[PDB]
Design an enzyme around this catalytic site. Sequence first.
Site, mmCIF file in Angstrom:
data_model
loop_
_atom_site.group_PDB
_atom_site.id
_atom_site.type_symbol
_atom_site.label_atom_id
_atom_site.label_comp_id
_atom_site.label_asym_id
_atom_site.label_seq_id
_atom_site.Cartn_x
_atom_site.Cartn_y
_atom_site.Cartn_z
ATOM 1 N N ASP B 290 10.594 14.764 1.569
ATOM 2 C CA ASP B 290 10.549 13.305 1.491
ATOM 3 C C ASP B 290 11.525 12.653 2.463
ATOM 4 O O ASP B 290 11.178 11.681 3.142
ATOM 5 C CB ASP B 290 10.834 12.850 0.076
ATOM 6 C CG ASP B 290 9.655 13.067 -0.850
ATOM 7 O OD1 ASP B 290 8.509 13.082 -0.383
ATOM 8 O OD2 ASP B 290 9.903 13.309 -2.049
ATOM 9 N N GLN B 298 12.858 3.850 3.784
ATOM 10 C CA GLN B 298 11.771 2.966 4.219
ATOM 11 C C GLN B 298 10.933 2.460 3.047
ATOM 12 O O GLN B 298 10.388 1.344 3.086
ATOM 13 C CB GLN B 298 10.879 3.749 5.183
ATOM 14 C CG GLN B 298 9.752 3.074 5.764
ATOM 15 C CD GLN B 298 9.446 3.712 7.088
ATOM 16 O OE1 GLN B 298 9.656 3.103 8.133
ATOM 17 N NE2 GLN B 298 9.007 4.971 7.060
ATOM 18 N N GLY B 372 3.915 7.629 -2.541
ATOM 19 C CA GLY B 372 2.659 8.057 -3.158
ATOM 20 C C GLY B 372 2.742 7.986 -4.692
ATOM 21 O O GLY B 372 2.947 6.917 -5.283
ATOM 22 N N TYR B 374 5.017 9.603 -6.598
ATOM 23 C CA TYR B 374 6.381 9.852 -7.067
ATOM 24 C C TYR B 374 7.277 8.650 -6.921
ATOM 25 O O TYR B 374 7.191 7.873 -5.969
ATOM 26 C CB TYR B 374 7.047 11.012 -6.328
ATOM 27 N N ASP B 375 8.166 8.492 -7.925
ATOM 28 C CA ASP B 375 9.217 7.482 -7.919
ATOM 29 C C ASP B 375 10.556 8.190 -8.182
ATOM 30 O O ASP B 375 10.664 8.985 -9.098
ATOM 31 C CB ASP B 375 8.972 6.384 -8.944
ATOM 32 C CG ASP B 375 7.573 5.697 -8.708
ATOM 33 O OD1 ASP B 375 6.541 6.359 -8.906
ATOM 34 O OD2 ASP B 375 7.532 4.529 -8.245
#
Lengths: 621, 621
Positions: B290, B298, B372, B374-375
């Site tokens: 990531d 970003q 996408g 995932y957080d």
Amino acid sequence: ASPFRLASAGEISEVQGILRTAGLLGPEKRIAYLGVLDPARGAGSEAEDRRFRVFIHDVSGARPQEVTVSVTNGTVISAVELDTAATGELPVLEEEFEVVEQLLATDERWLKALAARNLDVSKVRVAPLSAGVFEYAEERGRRILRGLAFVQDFPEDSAWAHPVDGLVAYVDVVSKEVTRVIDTGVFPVPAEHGNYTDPELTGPLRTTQKPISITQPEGPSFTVTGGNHIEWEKWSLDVGFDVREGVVLHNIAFRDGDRLRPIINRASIAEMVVPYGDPSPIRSWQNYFDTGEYLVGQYANSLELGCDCLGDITYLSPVISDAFGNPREIRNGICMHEEDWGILAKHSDLWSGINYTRRNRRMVISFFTTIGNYDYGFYWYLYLDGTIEFEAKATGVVFTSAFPEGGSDNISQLAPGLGAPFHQHIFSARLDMAIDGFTNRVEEEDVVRQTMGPGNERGNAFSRKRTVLTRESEAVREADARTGRTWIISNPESKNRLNEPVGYKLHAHNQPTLLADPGSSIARRAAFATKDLWVTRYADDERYPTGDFVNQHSGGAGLPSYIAQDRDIDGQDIVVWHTFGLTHFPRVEDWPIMPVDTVGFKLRPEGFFDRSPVLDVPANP
Amino acid sequence: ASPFRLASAGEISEVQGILRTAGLLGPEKRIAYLGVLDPARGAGSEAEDRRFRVFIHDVSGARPQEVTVSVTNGTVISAVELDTAATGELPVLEEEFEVVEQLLATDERWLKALAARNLDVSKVRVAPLSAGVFEYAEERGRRILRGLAFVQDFPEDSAWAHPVDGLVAYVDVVSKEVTRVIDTGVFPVPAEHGNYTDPELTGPLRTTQKPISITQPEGPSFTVTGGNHIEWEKWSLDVGFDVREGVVLHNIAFRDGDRLRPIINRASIAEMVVPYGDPSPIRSWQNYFDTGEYLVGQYANSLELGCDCLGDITYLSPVISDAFGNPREIRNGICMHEEDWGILAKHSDLWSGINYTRRNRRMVISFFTTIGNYDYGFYWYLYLDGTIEFEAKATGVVFTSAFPEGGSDNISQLAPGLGAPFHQHIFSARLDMAIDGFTNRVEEEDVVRQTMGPGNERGNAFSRKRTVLTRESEAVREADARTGRTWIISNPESKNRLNEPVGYKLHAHNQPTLLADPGSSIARRAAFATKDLWVTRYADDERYPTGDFVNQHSGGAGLPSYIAQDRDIDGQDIVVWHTFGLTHFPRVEDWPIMPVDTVGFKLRPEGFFDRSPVLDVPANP
Ligand SMILES: [Cu+2]
Ligand SMILES: [Cu+2]
Ligand code: NA
Ligand code: NA
């Protein structure tokens, strides 16, 4: 009225009257332990039978009794006389603690040792510590306490800053007699003070801290009915209090839809042990079992608002018995509040355009106890998502010694001439499991490494294996952090909608277990502390991992005796015992009062629910 | 103005103008990374030299450039053309992400695979994932993304609930070309929805939660000057923001008396990796970095008051560059607040009669990113007692697949027909240490078991050993939870009042490291993730544990290349790299949106101070 209700001041008075009448509560008698027994399995329907267990000591030297009484009917149920050289002594009494310094003050060998060191006997405090079992033959059958000396310079002075090393005494506090005084040499008593409220040591206090204000303008979200039954965010439980174990949690359950599903039947810290790692003969005997020997709930603090507990606080004030059967209230001894706990779940989805955030919360049940120089907080946490966590907070003043001028491999230096021997603080959690009822089993889950080859051509695969523990002799397990080892407690007869057994996963912290040599006296008495996880078949009389009478008992009692029965635990009524603790190498920052350090464990749902149990939590106000 | 100040919208505009003028910022160019470089060692006195690093991509197919510019002087400093088959590609661009679904929509092999499954192409979302390096020879030198398909039933539907298994595509998003479509078989697309805001799935929302109100009637205790320099409860630091790493912490120091003592020079999460453990050819290539491939800063969220951050919140709004050099603000991207943290220290002393309680606090610096499904939340904590802690919070929606009717050893079932492959989330913390200055060393500390015998007659002793790491080739270490293993960073030239070196101790969580076979492609590219602890000699160009260009790079770059220099690290300017992560076996409770799970590390003072650093904290108001 619920059978798990807290003991009342009325009930305590009845037990004292029932024992007095029966002739068992004489004037030479002392109640050394009193607590209400838990209902027996299955007798929920119906009828009260509030029973109480009592340990009666005898100041004259006679044998103590174990006694059970029913207060709802009003008679003694059984009374048994104890051979304490056989089964161990009763717990230390509050009033025995000061007999040690008062006796030693008139002993000639002790006066002689203080005079060689030029110490005024009236300035010497004596810490009374449990004795253990070592080589001294004259102590078996005797009630023995050992005594270590500290100097107080003035009545407000912290004695811990001035240990008197090379000196120890042993005392018989029934016959009032100093069996031995051992003087191995003179050490300088360290001179600096450790008075953490003295403006000379603290300097000017900070003025930069601005207040944090935590309030619930509409009150808390939990309800308390019946004195101690809690309902909060689908959770249901009873908060009990025992003088030995402290806060005990009963009947933990979660309302899933309109089923109330059980999770744990009883949760407690059922023992703890504090072994010291200094081989000096002055201290190489010191190990305390705070819970089994001293009874930690007896020394619970009263918790102050805004200082010990912050926010919208609801208190419980448990009632215990003093040594004559008089009820004693511990005002504000248990704190209960809910706490914001950050973000529960969050996702911003590019494809649907939905931004979703929910906040977490926990409910906190805590108490704090003080035994001598140590202060221990006990915290139970229930989270919205079904997680259960326990956390122990260890603070207070370190136990001190002289620092030898050559240095030491087993002691660290806090200040000029002042040492703090190495030690551990080890807890045993006893979890009487009830995952969707009483048919439970334990699996051990390891991560599984896979080799590159056929079926795994890019070498990226990995897996997990679960091993069922079927008999008690298989159920003594150790940690393995490197394989991500956890334990799952499941109900093989209760499946979720995917047709897998419902379960909860136990996540340990994987701290070191008992370090003492396996042939030591402490490894025998604290056998439980040598392994991370034990599983037993439930039985009403198997309550503590060290047995019922810890003080001066030989080894063996408790867990290594229970598991020898090699009972079936595959889908049965089972009890999980988890050992966890802190290995404390004192640092300079621990002096002169120590910042909290923490250890604990948690249990998270593992396919207990059919989907996330927190979809119905609302957007925040 | 401090040289660690956040980049300004003005500075971004200057860099765009400086590159345009120089001819490097054409109309076919795209800025793929822009960030301010850190000052060089020792040049604090004096003179600004605000420099910026830029990666320039070229949409036509030409070679990209690495470029440094000085904006305080106003020229290009260096410009270098890159061979990307050699050193790896530039980071994925935001605009390349959608080219994959838009291209695939007109490819005949892809239309053919969707028609066999009776799927309307207009309902198929394509997740664009980084490609990695595997056996396909035609991909070396190419910019390649891989694509996995999910069905959206309606524009508000959660596509993650309907994976299309057995299908994957590979795309070249410079030449706009579908190199391969691989169709291994038809799987039913799982039918249930996962819409966690649908009242049909959530049921009635709770009305039992009452508000918690956290307020600071006098404002917060910390100050912010210069945009980003923080002073709080003796702590001093600068809060930086980089588009690749996210929140970066500079110049962490503690005011001890009237010395400002340094602790850490730079702290960041310098890489992360998400490897999947499913050996299916549809997914056995999926690993994301990531940080190195996507740039996590970003995609930082804007954090809402009362929802994402609760209490008295101060925000920072970092400025980054879009792909044309236009400044873009991330409004409310960093949250900063202080939080009550229970009891700091407590003791009730029987002998002196003094009852003493102090409460703890922490200051929290956080941001949250979404890539996408995932957080990820990133939390830095500073405590009153000198402790530094990092915590990662992982939430979002699990990445899904079909669940094969035979079952799977590498996937778990969330719902009928719906699987979630096993994976890890692994972080690398890079800690540029400055314990009382830049002369530092690392010792590894193990608990030491002692045998019963002479010198240890009761078998109760235990000890600890410290091993100094002197050269980089010695400084690749692994965890050992069973021996209580920790690492101490000390300054051998700075002693506390007991004449011992000042130090900080690193406490890891001891979670499993990278599970993939050591011969795999991912073990080569994520070499850092195979060990818990690396120590390097500082060097300005050694910034990330995977190297500067992670996307499609072969293995080897980064840490295993740095440590081969075998430099002196015994009392030198050193950098500690700590690997930590979560091994995620998805459970039913993770569906359809997952509760936060956490992992982290902390550093505590170890004889850094001369006594507790919190004696001057006041009794609570
Ligand atoms: Cu300790
Ligand atoms: Cu995950
Ligand atoms: Na049970
Ligand atoms: Na350094």
